[PDB]
């Protein structure tokens with residue numbers, strides 16, 4: 318069985334989305350530089366350490382799907398300069414997203430999260446993303462272009478033994494799911510900064526951590542059309558942080574109005590014919 | 606040809622959604638009391654008068670679809686006490702919406718707007734709503750439950766001669782649109798406070814104002830699943846106004862997290878497993 322296609326962020330940029338459209342997955346080598354990875358890791362470190370279990374009794378939106386050996390930290394903009402500057406303005410990310418979502422219009426971040434898996438973390442069940450938040454997605458016709466995609470960026474090594482993600486190539490086009498098996502999977506073996514890119518229809522799962530010693534960490538960026546509601550809110554992010562961002566990053570975080578691709582688009586999140594940013598006189602690129 | 610079914614808000618409440626599901630439209634008689642209509646009208650009056658043309662050159666999200674004799678004012682919560690208290694907490698509205706959207710989960714306001722049509726306003730072309738903002742909707746399978754519905758509430762009389770809305774009954778189930786004609790329509794003749802309820806697949810249009818003297822006004826409330834992005838933003842609504850609302854009204858305006866109907870729903874607009882309202886310590890029902 319064929320392995321996940323591997324592509325250069327630098328040279329193969331126009332090939333990335335076509336590859337995912339065909340195969341349902343691709344590895345983007347050096348999606349983030351080691352410097353960006355180092356900074357992201359340093360900045361999110363304490364927030365990962367303080368994060369409780371996904372279904373902690375203190376939470377009013379517990380996540381009952383993730384294992385108790387998973388820590389997931391979302392709403393990264395207030396935590397990480399590297400995320401809100403380097404990642405949210407990634408030229409590679411934006412080329413891919415505009416390639417993927419042009420039929421629909423603007424896209425934004427549905428969720429940007431760091432996931433850390435403790436040693437001995439079990440494999441997740443094979444799944445498609447979005448089914449525990451956006452039931453609407455299952456009602457889309459089979460030829461509807463993907464309405465979200467997920468960049469699973471390695472922040473530490475992904476190896477067979479430490480639970481590198483499994484994907485089923487071609488499963489984004491499956492309607493009948495009787496052949497869903499771990500027998501059908503291949504692995505996303507990755508170095509820090511590489512990214513596994515999948516669609517919302519790609520069947521995949523986190524792997525089993527079998528060493529008992531290694532802690533695997535990733536940055537998962539679910540990018541989706543601006544017509545779909547994010548899993549996470551940036552409503553509580555301080556205004557000085559928002560005003561430090563680029564206009565593009567502000568839009569990605571829901572601090573701007575949005576547009577569809579409809580010829581005479583009437584817009585999303587507008588205020589009596591004007592944008593959020595015009596109405597609220599939102600500054601951009603103001604240093605902290 | 607059969608007329609639009611007319612139902613009592615008081616007595617026929619459980620019948621309203623089934624009627625719309627079958628026929629694509631229903632008139633809800635006395636949906637709003639005359640007192641609520643009077644207050645809404647008084648409160649929005651000046652904002653309608655100052656509103657420019659839909660595609661005014663001053664706007665960065667011009668609406669190129671509506672006629673130059675249309676004034677549309679959305680983001681009503683800061684303008685109208687009647688809207689944000691009486692309308693957003695309407696028992697009838699909420700029964701209907703929970704009937705309609707239970708398959709998907711929570712619902713919210715995609716747009717609440719007052720539309721005023723000047724004398725001599727022409728008929729709109731026959732259309733389905735949502736196509737100039739949410740192209741995703743056209744990609745839904747035919748048996749997907751409606752993901753949005755629109756309450757067109759009369760704030761003045763709707764007569765044949767003054768441009769009462771046209772609908773095509775049963776057109777919410779049409780796939781082939783070759784028989785779309787004004788020949789196929791019936792009229793929503795309504796008194797102030799009555800509401801025409803349609804789905805996002807019901808083919809309809811504003812009628813021609815033929816008197817040259819009458820000014821028709823309506824309150825259009827597009828309610829949709831919380832998985833779809835609103836056409837309008839309440840991000841700039843003052844915190845004291847938001848904190849005066851019920852928790853339900855806050856959710857409807859995007860000042861709360863949201864839930865899907867998925868068995869182990871992980872939520873929408875959450876912040877590291879907690880809600881917007883818990884995170885921001887958002888008060889409710891605090892008088893102004």
Ligand SMILES: CN1C(=O)c2ccccc2NC(=O)[C@@H]1Cc1ccccc1
Pocket residue numbers: 380382383389430441442444445446447448449450537539871
């Ligand atoms: C539930 N779930 C997440 O929490 C998740 C986490 C990170 C990024 C995307 C994401 N979206 C999802 O739909 C997944 C789905 C899932 C996960 C584990 C086991 C079964 C299903």
Ligand SMILES: CN1C(=O)c2ccccc2NC(=O)[C@@H]1Cc1ccccc1
Pocket residue numbers: 583668670671677718729730732733734735736737738825827
């Ligand atoms: C464009 N458009 C609005 O502006 C509108 C106004 C009020 C409530 C819903 C609404 N949604 C829409 O999709 C309509 C569609 C339309 C209107 C006129 C002519 C052609 C198409």
Ligand SMILES: O=C(O)CCC(=O)C(=O)O
Pocket residue numbers: 441446469480481482483521522523524535
């Ligand atoms: O752990 C991984 O590599 C994948 C995680 C995942 O697919 C998910 O949580 O949705």
Ligand SMILES: O=C(O)CCC(=O)C(=O)O
Pocket residue numbers: 729734757768769770771809810811812823
């Ligand atoms: O004017 C009316 O009665 C209907 C308006 C309408 O359908 C629209 O603007 O989408």
Ligand code: NI
Pocket residue numbers: 444445446521522
């Ligand atoms: Ni997943």
Ligand code: NI
Pocket residue numbers: 732733734809810
């Ligand atoms: Ni309409």
